[PDB]
Design a protein around this ligand. Structure first.
Ligand SMILES: CC(=O)OCC[N+](C)(C)C
Length: 278
């Protein structure tokens, strides 16, 4: 039959690694072949693509974050525990879109606000509220995802009354260079970022609990499951197989050591026995 499915990803390190793992798992454990589609734009492009589906110049599968689905359903930022966010997006995406959330991969790749350790020491910063009190002295460098998202800086700024001198929209790797050079003093470090535990930075505490959980999980069209039911158990073989620490190390293999994400993804799966060597 030569059936194929389309796995989509935004172009960023973690997204392409986990999309590749999904692709490798499908090709290793089923007869299906996988088109890897890369999307440019924000955290909405994959959602609109999966509504279209692989037969309609969209995608069939991608790895989504629970908190993004939660804020999209609610229309307002909220906080809840991981199960609250996961069960809510799973039930709602099935009802409204016939999209199936599979099990979480294991890590929570949340937004953070992060400063240099020395700045945190110079002002005894521990929390977002501590930072807000001195924010009028500081420049924020952040990803376009953070600056444009409803769950990002817009709602965060209003809750804490952040007063940064200005914000600079920056590519993901650039923002680490920028804080290192003191071009900015705060960045939206993401919890799994490969360069994070490598730059002498302090992650501050979200003391008012603005952000939702951001647990990554594969999601798939129901009609693709209807045609290839084996995909559910195959993709759920990834369930809880990637801790925060594991994801950070894979991200660093790409961003810090220059390895290509296809090789990084496949070697991880082989090392953990999730695929066998052919
Ligand atoms: C681009 C993207 O989807 O990144 C997911 C991580 N997060 C929640 C910090 C934005």
């Amino acid at each position: 039959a030569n059936d194929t499915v389309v796995v989509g990803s935004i172009i960023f390190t973690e997204g392409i690694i986990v999309a590749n793992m999904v692709a490798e798992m499908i090709e290793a454990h089923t007869d299906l072949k996988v088109v890897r589609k890369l999307n440019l734009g924000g955290v909405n492009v994959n959602f609109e693509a999966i509504k279209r589906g692989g037969a309609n110049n969209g995608i069939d599968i991608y790895v989504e974050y629970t908190g993004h689905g939660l804020v999209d359903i609610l229309g307002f930022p909220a906080t809840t525990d991981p199960e609250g966010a996961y069960e809510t997006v799973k039930k709602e995406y099935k009802r409204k879109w016939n999209i199936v959330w599979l099990k979480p991969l294991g890590f929570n790749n949340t937004y953070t606000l992060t400063v240099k350790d020395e700045l945190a020491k110079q002002y005894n910063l521990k929390t977002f509220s501590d930072l807000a009190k001195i924010s009028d002295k500081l420049i924020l460098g952040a990803t376009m995802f953070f600056l444009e998202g409803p769950d990002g800086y817009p709602g965060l700024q209003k809750l804490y009354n952040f007063k940064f001198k200005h914000t600079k929209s920056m590519d993901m790797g650039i923002r680490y260079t920028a804080i290192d050079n003191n071009e900015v003093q705060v960045i939206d470090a993401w919890a799994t970022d490969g360069l994070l535990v490598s730059h002498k930075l302090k992650i501050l505490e979200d003391d008012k609990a603005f952000f939702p959980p951001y647990y990554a999980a594969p999601i798939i069209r129901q009609d693709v499951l209807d045609k290839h039911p084996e995909l559910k158990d195959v993709l759920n073989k990834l369930a809880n197989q990637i801790s925060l620490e594991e994801m950070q190390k894979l991200n660093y293999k790409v961003d810090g050591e220059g390895q290509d994400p296809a090789k990084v993804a496949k070697e991880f799966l082989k090392e953990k026995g999730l695929i066998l060597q052919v």
